[PDB]
């Protein structure tokens, strides 16, 4: 009686949801399943509050916000952290580095040019058709002077023979500062080739800070190379060999399905018959037959038959 009682449904709901998050003794569903910036920040706010026009629009409920300005500011402040969530959510950190997690810090930007009028961007989790990815994409990531780089683009789940391995698409090395044309093309650019009926493949862009120029002669690949046995590649072991001078700083990944252009890639240059896959569900469970299916309909016999066509044996 001393404690007050929730006077509204929402109060209980907010209490309940917060209550659910906390761990409990009893089994539950979840178990099984700087200062100067502050001062400057405040000062800008006060100016915004003073503006009468801001008040009038708000009370007239006609105000609006510029999305582009927020996006750029969001990138500076906490974009690294949100990007990390997507990478963990999409499984990049577990499939790439065997569970190691790195916060992206370089605001990497990639877009696939469609003709010349417009260019398709590649954000985190975006959808880009293989036709759109036929040619290599423009990359601008605001390196600043010096600080050599290496750009690595790979499809994590596109391998056709070994599950763990993945296929390199193009690898640029010794990229000095912003300019990317000055990079050694160890791996030539290949169009994405996701098999038909194989679901959505996730392709990611990886940028590594380079302390000192290192010749990646082992990772150099002949240009052009159309052999999948040579495109097989593990990010995890590769980063081990270069972890001294390679530290990741950028991310960008997109999802793509199969497409008619994929048919061209499998035949024209890969020079192999294209693989076709289908989603197969497991056979339905039926209890073991009984010689006498007592109290069962006539359909019982059809459940355990394989061929729908009559047979005659000796006749």
């Amino acid at each position: 009686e001393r404690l007050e009682k929730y006077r509204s449904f929402e109060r209980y709901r907010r209490r309940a949801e917060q209550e659910a998050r906390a761990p409990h003794w009893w089994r539950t569903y979840r178990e099984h399943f700087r200062t100067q910036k502050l001062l400057e920040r405040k000062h800008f706010l006060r100016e915004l509050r003073a503006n009468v026009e801001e008040e009038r629009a708000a009370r007239l409920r006609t105000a609006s916000i510029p999305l582009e300005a927020v996006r750029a500011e969001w990138e500076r402040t906490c974009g690294p952290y949100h990007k990390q969530r997507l990478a963990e959510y999409y499984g990049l950190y577990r499939d790439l580095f065997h569970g190691a997690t790195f916060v992206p810090w370089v605001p990497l930007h990639v877009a696939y040019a469609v003709g010349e009028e417009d260019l398709i961007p590649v954000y985190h989790g975006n959808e880009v058709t293989p036709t759109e990815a036929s040619r290599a994409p423009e990359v601008t990531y605001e390196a600043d002077k010096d600080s050599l780089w290496t750009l690595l683009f790979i499809n994590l789940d596109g391998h056709l023979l070994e599950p763990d391995a993945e296929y390199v698409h193009w690898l640029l090395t010794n990229i000095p500062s912003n300019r990317v044309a000055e990079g050694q093309e160890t791996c030539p650019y290949l169009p994405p080739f996701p098999a038909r009926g194989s679901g959505f493949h996730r392709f990611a862009f990886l940028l590594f800070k380079q302390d000192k120029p290192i010749n990646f002669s082992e990772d150099t690949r002949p240009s052009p190379c159309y052999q999948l046995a040579q495109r097989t590649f593990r990010t995890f072991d590769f980063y081990k060999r270069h972890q001294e001078a390679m530290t990741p700083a950028g991310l960008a990944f997109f999802q793509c399905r199969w497409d008619d252009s994929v048919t061209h890639t499998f035949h024209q240059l890969l020079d192999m018959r294209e693989p076709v896959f289908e989603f197969v569900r497991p056979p339905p469970y039926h209890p073991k037959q009984k010689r006498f299916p007592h109290e069962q309909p006539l359909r019982y016999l059809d459940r355990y038959r394989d061929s729908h066509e009559p047979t005659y044996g000796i006749y």
């Binding site: 309940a16 659910a20 569903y29 009926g197 194989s198 018959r273 693989p275 076709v276």
Partner: protein, 100 residues
């Protein structure tokens, strides 16, 4: 009659198996477990049955449940028992059908 728990916690249960029959809500539907008209509990997936307690939030539309919920003391919330089946197999797998 013979009301009770047909399937206990830790048992492999197929898609349609009945888990419990009840005259009153002794247990409540959970995840992948459905309700029959007679309030019996049946699995909706193949998996392992689990009984677990969790907070109860009722549909806003029904008046009586909301009033009782609101009248609860601010300190805590009421609980109930829920039944769960943990799916034990993947939905499906991709296989090579043809090479063209």
């Amino acid at each position: 009659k013979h009301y009770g728990i047909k399937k206990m916690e830790g048992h492999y249960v197929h898609a349609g198996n009945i888990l419990g029959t009840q005259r009153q809500f002794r247990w409540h539907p959970g995840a992948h477990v459905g309700l029959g008209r007679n309030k019996c509990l049946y699995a909706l997936e193949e998996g392992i049955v689990r009984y677990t307690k969790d907070v109860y939030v009722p549909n806003p539309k029904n008046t009586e449940a909301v009033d009782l919920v609101t009248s609860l003391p601010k300190g805590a919330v009421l609980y109930k028992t829920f039944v769960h089946v943990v799916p034990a197999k993947p939905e499906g797998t991709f296989k090579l059908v043809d090479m063209l």
